[PDB]
Amino acid sequence: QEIKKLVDQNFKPLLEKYDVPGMAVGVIQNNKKYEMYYGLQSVQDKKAVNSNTIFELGSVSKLFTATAGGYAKNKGKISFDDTPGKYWKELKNTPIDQVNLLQLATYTSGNLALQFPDEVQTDQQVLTFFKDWKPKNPIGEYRQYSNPSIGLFGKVVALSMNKPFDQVLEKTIFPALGLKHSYVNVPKTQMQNYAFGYNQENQPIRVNPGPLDAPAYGVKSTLPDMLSFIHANLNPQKYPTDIQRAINETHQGRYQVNTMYQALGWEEFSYPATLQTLLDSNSEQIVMKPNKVTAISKEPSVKMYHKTGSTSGFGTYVVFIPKENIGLVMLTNKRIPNEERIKAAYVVLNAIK
Ligand SMILES: *[B@]([O])([C][N]S(=O)(=O)C1=C(C(F)(F)F)[C]=C(C2=NN=N[N]2)[C]=[C]1)OP([O])([O])=O
Structure with a gap:
């Protein structure tokens, strides 16, 4: 009843403030879904955002990789104490066959950065990257937020399930979640529904191919x-x-x-959390640098979870709180600061609870 009015108060100003062409905000509460849509999926085509609009999730994709890993661990196909060598035959007995599936998933190999270097691209030279991989920091002790790390995990999960990664998600994981329009590759019959992302010059763009x-x-x-x-x-x-x-x-x-x-993918906090706690989670320091891990001391009673994502042209934020049976999704076809994503959601989910 107030849900639409709250989203309007807190999400709608962000479109003008950041010259965002298009935004979709979803709230789920007590098993009732609310969808709110604003602006355009394509500026040049004057096509509006609607329930068929396809957006790029960026690193919210990691939640699907994490889920696919949990599925494989519970079908017996993998164990999170395993190492890559058990599945990627060409890496077995290499120093990367010393780091385990969990550590890859959760970013602790000691020596992986946010990106593969630009020169790495083909199936052949990804294999060579991990062959020549040599340790740096103490395996398991340091959190390094990393596309190569989780990528390796996904590629491994795919190996354990026999099928390439793209088929794991689209033939196995997405149907089991009841998802009818989620894709690793957008088919031809759906290209009309794929939004343009918009860069910081408001030029229309979509995601560039890269390694894993x-x-x-x-x-x-x-x-x-x-x-x-x-x-x-x-x-x-x-x-x-x-x-x-x-x-x-x-x-x-x-x-x-x-x-x-x-x-596994999700960031977890004690609920209720302060706004500032939610922001610190996506600081330069956490996101860009290595940071030393500590064992969980206080196991939170009531937990919430979140995850940001970004491609060059798209912003995503996802948050849910089990004990309040409440969650939010924000999807945009221009990046806005992670902090604005996190904050608007804070005010809406509080105002409803
Ligand atoms: B993820 O979405 C991974 N972010 S990223 O920083 O590695 C990344 C970006 C961008 F810089 F936008 F975040 C963009 C692209 C991109 N490839 N082709 N077009 N755009 C890839 C990776 O997590 P968070 O939310 O923390 O950034």
Whole structure:
């Protein structure tokens, strides 16, 4: 009743403030979905954002990679104590076959940065990168937010399931989540629904191919689909047994970096959380530098979870709180500062609770 008015108060000004052509905000509360749409999926085409608009999720893709890993661990196909060598035959007995599937997933190999270097691109020279991989920091002790790390994990998960990564998500994970319009590759019959992203010059753009892009930042979805994914995270008991387990796996905190608990993809906090706690989670320091991990001391009673994502032309934020049975999704076709994403959501979900 007030939900639409709250989103209007808190999300709608951001379109003018950052010259964002288009935005989709979804709220799910007590199993009722609310969708709110603003502006255009394509400026040049004057095509409006609607329930069919496909946006790039950026690193919110990692939540799908994490979920696919939980599914594989609960079908017996993998173990999070394993190392890559067990699956990627060409890496076995190399120094990367010393780091385990969990550590890759949660960014602790000691020696992986946010990107593969630009020169790495083909299937052949990704293999060579990890062959010549040599340690630096103490395996398992330092959190380094990393596309190569989680990418490796996804590629491994795919190996364990026999099928390439793109097929794991589209033939296995997305259907098991009831998602009808989420893709690693947008088919031809859906290109008309794929938004333009818009860069900082407001030029229209879409995501560039890169090494192990699919598992790290390569998923595209709609607002109804993302609201179903949040529904699943809030109420997994209803889903097939194996995806229930996969989902519960993604909620288990593994370590803390001060006040952010790292789960499989999801960031976890004690609920209620202060706004500032939610922001610090995505600081330069956490995001860009290595940081020393600490074991979980206070196991939070009531937990919330979040994740940001960005491609060059798109912004995503996703948040849910199990015990309040509430969640939010924001999708945009121009990046806005992570902090503005996190803050508007804070004010809406509080105002409703
Ligand atoms: B993720 O979405 C990964 N972010 S990223 O920083 O590695 C990244 C970006 C961008 F800089 F936008 F974030 C963009 C692209 C891109 N590739 N082709 N077109 N754009 C790839 C990676 O997590 P967070 O939210 O922390 O940035």
